[PDB]
């Protein structure tokens, strides 16, 4: 996307979102990141929405194929699951590469740095979902390390109701439950996050209250499923 203006890439990413063309949206946002400038809050959201939709479709397909393969146990189901898996890994590697070149290193404000480190944790988590064996171990540790650094910053620099802090805690709790085989840690983190947010709601405007309580309900939904 080297020949397209940064502003045009951003505009087209917004159009692609409206048109539900998430692969295009991700390509436009990759082009925008590669212009080398930092991303604004809204631009970070466009980047994240684009890739979350792309990798979300790949994950759903991988789970369908992996289930068929497990029930079967010719080479075709395994071959096709492997094809989808390689594609998924390629998208995760692309996102991680953007974060490493050079979004995280230039992100100094807590809102940007936490956002990108949460993304890093999430895309290593998606890699861990399809990994096996010792490869799984290092990938799991990479996700954990990213989430932990984000958590440390968020607790020092953001109020307990901040939506990014809440979503980070939600996703790290899912990591503990689904990836790290630590359901007690998952439940403890979700509980403590919910309770500390509750106690801070009194400080919020109507609009912020709506955002924070929406995410707190997701924490509660997981707690209900886990307990």
């Amino acid at each position: 996307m080297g020949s397209m203006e940064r502003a045009s890439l951003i505009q087209k990413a917004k159009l692609a979102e409206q048109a539900e063309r998430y692969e295009d949206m991700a390509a436009f946002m990759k082009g925008a990141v590669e212009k080398g400038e930092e991303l604004s809050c809204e631009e970070r959201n466009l980047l994240s929405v684009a890739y979350k939709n792309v990798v979300g479709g790949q994950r759903a397909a991988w789970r369908v194929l992996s289930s068929i393969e497990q029930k079967s146990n010719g080479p075709e189901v395994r071959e096709y699951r492997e094809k989808v898996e390689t594609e998924l890994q390629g998208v995760c590697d692309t996102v991680l590469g953007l974060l490493d070149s050079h979004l995280i290193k230039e992100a100094g404000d807590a809102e940007s740095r936490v956002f990108y480190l949460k993304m890093k944790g999430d895309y290593y988590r998606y890699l861990a979902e399809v990994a096996t064996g010792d490869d799984k171990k290092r990938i799991i540790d990479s996700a954990r390390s990213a989430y932990q650094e984000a958590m440390d910053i968020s607790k020092k620099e953001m109020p307990p109701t901040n939506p990014i802090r809440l979503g980070l805690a939600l996703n790290f709790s899912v990591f503990h439950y689904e990836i790290a085989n630590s359901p007690e840690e998952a439940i403890s983190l979700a509980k403590t996050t919910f309770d500390e947010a509750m106690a801070d709601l009194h400080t919020l405007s109507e609009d912020s209250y709506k955002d924070s309580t929406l995410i707190m309900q997701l924490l509660r939904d997981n707690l209900t499923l886990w307990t």
Binding site: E17, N45, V49, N53, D122, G167, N171, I215, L218, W226
Partner: peptide, 9 residues
Amino acid sequence: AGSIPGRRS
């Protein structure tokens, strides 16, 4: 369980 949906923004 459920991570943040994050597919609309």
